[PDB]
Design a binder for this molecule. Structure first.
Ligand code: NAP
Ligand code: NAP
Ligand code: MG
Ligand code: MG
Ligand code: MG
Ligand code: MG
Ligand code: MG
Ligand code: MG
Lengths: 479, 479
């Protein structure tokens, strides 16, 4: 007569999640502040499994088997803190509050401190895949005490996406580690979509291909190493004809990316952690620029292009160019992921989480928009070398870069000569050529700062800080 | 027997600032929590002018002529709030608390609300030029109530940098406007230093010039449109020989800028405001990458370069290439400033500040690391069009871009073919080519997001939001 799991918040995400639990053989307690949403779920979806509805938090908590597991699925921020307090007040020692919402990981850290203190357990659970994932099988990223997973894990494994028998959930780490890895996942999604956008742009405006032909190229690419959900749905979007006009649907869509989106959080965290996420960063900046409606209108046809050429005048074969774009897309995808996994290691180190990157690449293979067989290469890279300094240095990926790099350079040159924007492709190659470099112009920056501000520099041949007496005899002294 | 201005916090920045006030004929109250610093200022510099040293906040406040003007120069964050509260409790209605520290503008906004509600005035003042500017003439960016500038303005004008008889201080706007434009100024400084670094890297590793020769090139550029303090000091740094090794000083400096600075705050604000600051962003990312010591050590000689060429094999004239790099530097500087001024506009609109960008380009000509005669072109651009959509569209600058664009494309092509990193040069050209684009891949992103999440899109040819039934008959409905 008791539920093993409960959901508070029965808007579409929490209702879909409750249904998932119930379809997979769990008894599920459900509560919503407004009872009409609870009544609607029972009325329209009660045949999907065993639900225990409650009108009050006290009734809801009383319906859960100890140790009690309540997932919150409400509005992020103040509304989730309100429900955490209501559950906290009603629960016993050893009970488990789970926020499944899209929390700021710093909110989850603060909540885990306040709730662990109250004698309760707090889990911040990132849930991927949006409404469809919540209903049919998400990737789940729980952070909190490791002993919370003993009672919660088997429940989450019952609803998670399954890939080759492996549920897309495992314990990520303490406190905010789950919401953190979910946030980085969101930023990676932006980069994956932007590198596809850039490939599309070159195939259309350099190779002269219409959307229906580009769809067919993407389906061919999707049979090879790039194989991915995002490339699969890209072909379906490029194939779609607008019934009203007969034009490709993409050609009647307003080309301004929804300014609603959390990819910016990923880049803010990378800026704080000292990680160069050029790929996610340029993908976010590209969405922002697309929305600058009045600036784009004022710019159109008014900035000098310079002398441009075209593939025919360059003597470039269309088939060779299309393959070069594929290889630029793969290289740029690989840089964006290497940077994202750098951000995961930096966040883990900063927060003492011991995040295992193999767990992330494993559970992102199902119920995620970014799912692709590429992720198995990330698992294998870290399996081979738990302390790998960059995904680019994995023996498999490094050997792949050997075959990509000539194409990648040709795409940057060619796009530039045709006046076509390629922000993540170009920025990824400058980042790559920066990691290759023996000496970077940061040495000059250190010298400039010592000149104007006496900020001091380190030396390659001696430990310590040094200063040149710029305003004086320009001798070097110790700082 | 009363001071017209006071300084709280007598570490080097505040001691320098107090000395500046005193050298310029003001009577200056000085106070530091630790009395030993007050004793030290009086002992070492009391001859420079009329100081009134106090050991306690109450004596300090009693030494000030009403309406009292106290400038706080202490550790940013909680320490600044601690000193604000101690002054506020000791002061009378109409008194003026000024924070001259490197405040987060959101902290200034909060402080101005709290302190104004108590019948005091709060000013957040950005002070540029570091320790040297505090002593010898800074750029000063005060935000707070306009009436505050009437008693404070003449004191700030007595110490500010002066350019052709114009003091580098004016009232910026309400509450946080001052600390906000200082934060953007800090980001711009990063971009100015990075574009100089990229030019240096190309002249050294593409044109085969040694640092002493590059120093002579920068001095010649400094005679033309690029004329700047940063280019002047760059030639002095590149001329410098390390006595101990005989190598160029730059060659014995550790090429790691790391994360010792606040340029990241500029990018985080840009991300929240929806502004594509690709120049400042890539500059900050480049500093972060330079500091990844273990990763760079692991990457050296392990990432495939691809087939590279050189200027000789390309048939490129060295003098033509050097001028092309100058013009890439100019174009990329202009893009970084255009984006920073877009960030200033977006911040001013979000916060109802009515920031006049002419004020900023006027007062950054003195006592700022970014000072350059280029800033006059920004004043003139906004003089001609208060609602200018981008600095790129100013008639003078658009005319300049007609002469820069062919060079700029050649530099991205050539750097790419030689395997040299140019993150701001290349990202600035993708941004430029993105403003030139009729249609951006943002249309494909809108289609993808509608496919996987039913996120809806807008149409170019009629009003409202639409959804294509991707899982069903792929008909379109209004949303
Ligand atoms: N659809 C998407 O694109 C997407 C993707 C991922 C996640 N999400 C989900 O979106 C939700 C965010 O909510 P929203 O603001 O957008 O929708 P909403 O309908 O305004 O709120 C959702 C739920 O929050 C509850 N709630 C709000 N304030 C509360 C309070 N103070 N005390 C108790 N319950 C409270 C509501 O209860 P009432 O019914 O009583 O109002 C409702 O059940 C999260 O659950 C998140 O998981 C969105
Ligand atoms: N190189 C630099 O450090 C540098 C460069 C840029 C800007 N600044 C400027 O210098 C200030 C920052 O100082 P810092 O943090 O770098 O150095 P710090 O040595 O940690 O402290 C700087 C000053 O803050 C005072 N202070 C700290 N906590 C305080 C508190 N709770 N109550 C009152 N006074 C307090 C100290 O007083 P005591 O002597 O009593 O400790 C000292 O006068 C700001 O005004 C900033 O704009 C410094
Ligand atoms: Mg039935
Ligand atoms: Mg299932
Ligand atoms: Mg292969
Ligand atoms: Mg580890
Ligand atoms: Mg002076
Ligand atoms: Mg000229």
């Amino acid at each position: 007569n008791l539920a093993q799991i409960g959901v508070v918040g029965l808007a579409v995400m929490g209702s879909n999640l409750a249904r998932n639990f119930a379809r997979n053989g769990n008894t599920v307690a459900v509560y919503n502040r407004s009872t009409d949403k609870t009544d609607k779920l029972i009325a329209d979806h009660g045949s999907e499994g065993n639900f225990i509805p409650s009108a009050t938090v006290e009734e809801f908590v009383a319906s859960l088997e100890k140790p009690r597991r309540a997932i919150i699925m409400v509005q992020a921020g103040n509304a989730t803190d309100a429900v955490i307090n209501q559950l906290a007040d009603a629960m016993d020692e050893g009970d488990i509050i789970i926020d499944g919402g899209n929390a700021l990981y710093t909110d989850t850290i603060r909540r885990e401190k306040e709730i662990s203190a109250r004698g309760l357990h707090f889990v911040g659970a990132g849930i991927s895949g949006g409404e469809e994932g919540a209903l049919n099988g998400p990737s789940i990223m729980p952070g909190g005490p490791a002993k919370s997973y003993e009672s919660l894990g088997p429940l989450l494994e019952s609803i998670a996406a399954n890939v080759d028998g492996t549920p897309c959930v495992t314990h990520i780490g303490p406190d905010g580690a789950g919401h953190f890895v979910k946030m980085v996942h969101n930023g990676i999604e932006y980069a994956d979509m932007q590198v596809i956008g850039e490939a599309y742009h070159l195939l259309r405006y350099a190779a002269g291909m219409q959307p229906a032909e580009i769809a067919e190229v993407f389906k061919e690419w999707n049979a090879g190493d790039l194989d991915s959900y995002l490339i699969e749905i890209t072909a379906e979007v490029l194939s779609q004809v607008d019934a009203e006009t007969g034009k490709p649907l993409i050609d009647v869509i307003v080309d301004a990316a929804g300014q609603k989106g959390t990819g910016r959080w990923t880049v803010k965290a990378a800026l704080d952690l000292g990680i160069a996420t050029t790929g996610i960063g340029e993908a976010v900046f590209a969405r922002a620029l697309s929305g600058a409606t009045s600036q784009r209108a004022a710019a159109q046809g008014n900035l000098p292009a310079g002398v441009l050429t075209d593939l025919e005048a360059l003597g470039v074969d269309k088939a060779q160019f299309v393959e070069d774009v594929r290889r630029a897309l793969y290289a740029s995808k690989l840089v964006a992921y290497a940077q994202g996994f750098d951000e995961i290691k930096a966040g883990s180190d900063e927060n003492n989480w011991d995040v295992d990157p193999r767990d992330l690449a494993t559970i992102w293979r199902g119920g995620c928009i970014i799912r692709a067989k590429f992720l198995n290469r990330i698992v294998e890279a870290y399996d081979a070398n738990a302390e790998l300094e960059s995904l680019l240095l994995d023996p498999y990926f490094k050997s792949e870069l050997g075959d990509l790099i000539d194409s990648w350079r040709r795409v940057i040159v060619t796009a530039t000569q045709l006046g076509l924007p390629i922000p993540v492709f170009a920025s990824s190659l400058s980042y790559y050529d920066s990691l290759r470099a023996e000496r970077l112009p940061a040495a000059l920056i250190q010298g400039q700062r010592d000149f104007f501000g006496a900020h001091t520099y380190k030396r390659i041949d001696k430990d310590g800080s040094f200063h040149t007496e710029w305003s004086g005899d320009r001798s070097e002294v110790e700082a």
